[PDB]
Design a protein around this nucleic acid. Sequence first.
RNA 1: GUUGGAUCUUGAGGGCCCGCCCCUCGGCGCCCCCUCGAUGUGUCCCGCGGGGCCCGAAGCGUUUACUUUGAAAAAAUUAGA
Lengths: 150, 208, 82, 84, 190, 129
Amino acid sequence: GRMHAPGKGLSQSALPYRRSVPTWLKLTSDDVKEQIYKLAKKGLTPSQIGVILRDSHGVAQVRFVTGNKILRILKSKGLAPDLPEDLYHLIKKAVAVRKHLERNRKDKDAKFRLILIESRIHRLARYYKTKRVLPPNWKYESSTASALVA
Amino acid sequence: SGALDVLQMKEEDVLKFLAAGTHLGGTNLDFQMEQYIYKRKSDGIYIINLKRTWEKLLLAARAIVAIENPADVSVISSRNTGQRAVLKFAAATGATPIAGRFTPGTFTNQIQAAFREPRLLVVTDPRADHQPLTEASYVNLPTIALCNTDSPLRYVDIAIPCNNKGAHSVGLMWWMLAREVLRMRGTISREHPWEVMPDLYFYRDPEE
Amino acid sequence: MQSNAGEFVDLYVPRKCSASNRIIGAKDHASIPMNVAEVDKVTGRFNGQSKTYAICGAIRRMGESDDSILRLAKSHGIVSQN
Amino acid sequence: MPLAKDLLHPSPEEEKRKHKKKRLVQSPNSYFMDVKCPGCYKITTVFSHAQTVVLCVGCSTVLCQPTGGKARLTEGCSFRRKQH
Amino acid sequence: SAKIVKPNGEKPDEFESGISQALLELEMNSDLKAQLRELNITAAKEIEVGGGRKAIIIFVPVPQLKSFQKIQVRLVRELEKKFSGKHVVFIAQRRILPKPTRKSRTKNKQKRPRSRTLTAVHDAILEDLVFPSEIVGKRIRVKLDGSRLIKVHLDKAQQNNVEHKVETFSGVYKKLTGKDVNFEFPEFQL
Amino acid sequence: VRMNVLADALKSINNAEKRGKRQVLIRPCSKVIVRFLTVMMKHGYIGEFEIIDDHRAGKIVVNLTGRLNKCGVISPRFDVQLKDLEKWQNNLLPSRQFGFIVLTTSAGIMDHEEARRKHTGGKILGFFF
RNA sequence: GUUGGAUCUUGAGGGCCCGCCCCUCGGCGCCCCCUCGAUGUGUCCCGCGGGGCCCGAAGCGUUUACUUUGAAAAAAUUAGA
């Protein structure tokens, strides 16, 4: 079910049944987190950290190395992105349309998509307001859209 | 099974399967005949499994065997390549040969030019013999059909995979299925293969 | 279909199938048994009683009966090369 | 099919041809490989669908050519998952 | 010092007397020194199995187990030699969190995840059986009688050390849960 | 999405018995799905079933038999105080001689027969005959 | 608005039945007290008597929906002796 997006395909990966991945070189928590904490010092998203944890290193994910995932490690560190990183790219998607809408007052495609992208934001970000991930008194805004991306 | 040894394909059979080209099949995808396919050629021509040929050659004969009459076994060949073969099948087995058109109504049709009372039907190609296969389905008649890798399978009881189209693959199976029944019931008894060649068989090839 | 313990209500018992676990009814067309002769055991000269297998038209009109008796004559025997 | 089959243990080609999230047991076949290219003096673990470069320090700037599918290699190498 | 091996308030003697005297020698064993000097097992259990052998169950709260798991192939086989064929196993034991229900008293609960449930600890026993083979998948075959025989799809490599212990590992988990277990190396990476 | 994890599975196995098919891939495998599978396994409408353990949601392959004629869902469910149960045996079961209705009751998921024997209802699940 | 994914444990008696498994009462205990059998303002078989506390047990531990139990549920009515 996708009312947030017109797609019907696939953007997500498969994960193996085993929690012991890859069981030929399981680089430790200290191997991944000191990489992670440098990448948290370098400030990448866990979407970007977990890719470069996967392909460069001898391990794939930290949910197989540790029990925590990257944002869980970043929360347990406390140094974590103060908005959800997927929601951050959602807010990033709206600013890029909005600035393009700020460029073209005739791009009727950009007028329609900025509704649905922010509607995808307003249904996503609302959920993180509830569970103390976003502050619930905060609310998404086109003013606050470019503020969070910048 | 009978004498289990020559009932597990002899090289005399094996060469004749290669000689008549029975192992070959079409190019079409199956969902009921792909089990009977051994392999496929480069960019697709199906080598059928001659194991599946022989094991259905046994059991479909065994369906005819222990019927005390070949008269209620109406064997069917609309293909002219098998019309000599069902002539030499009815010469050997004694079954009822059906050459050419079914003349729709021999199984239905009280008022008709004909009426037949078989029990089991043997078919060269169920697409070439669909009008038998219709009136097989009309009056509760089981039907053996020689099926290639492009054949229809609806209302088709036990099916012997063969190339069974055009070539001597037709007349070899009628040589072999009359072999298998005389192997079981006949003077070629006790599961011995034939001494009669498929040259009394394979179709006429108008001569000089 | 029977009634109380020894009392039989139905007019008859309709036949069945082993390929779809489904009954063969009253006057059902292309709904046939398949009598396959017990051929014997290298001594030869086939032994009488044919192995019976009831086939309905439903597995016939769906084109299932070829592998079905292959699931009944190979699986139960007897057949050479199996 | 004759519509009567049951494959509690099917052939490992009809699941293995599927998409990784369309399997009977959804576990990917994307994997790690260990790069024997002489551009590096070392053997570096690279994921198949790496999507990105993986380099080293024994090499300067090439260990693999990146690819969003299974990653592009230079001069031929070995490869081992190992145990997925 | 193997001095918590036999004492856990436990009535064993001889095998816990043996395993402690084993572990003291395993402490005194080279390559096995300085990983068992501090890691001494909390409890041991000697049951028989379907393989006709006795199964030394070694209880570990898993700060201990990860060095016990680390060797487990010479370490068992030395004790299998030291105790004459006994297929030793190093079974995890947590403080298993109780039933989520009412009376049949539920004294205190603070948080019970599926990281601390009882079915988590049952599967932790299954991993600590098979150190060479890793559980690739599982298929519980629910029989028409209502019985259930799980088919533990293991690593198809390193499979052979399990094969003489399958009869033990089926015998062990039978005594544990009142339920058999079956181990497969079915078609993974093949 | 799958609002009813049973009705998405019942449409599978009915169409399977329409095809005569002897295997299904059901998902996302609630235990409530499993308890219905265990009961109808006892009644001989079907054969045994084998779950394949996945960490996505798990899936079950079910070997069935052709002894069943209709298995339906009460979607959405309702409460049964053992007095509506006969009317579902009237309106929805073909006779009072055969046909089984399964209920989640607070002595566990059970049929209608143990529900009458214990006299403690719950919510209605579905039927099979 | 209305609907929504998975996921946490309970052997014997007789040819099913039971409790189990991975404090306020009763009440095994403890001391106090009139003390019970050593002893006849009081011990050491133990609160069994009250307890007190703490157990198996229980306020237990997150609760309901739900179901079930009863009570309650004008007469007439209506079902029906």
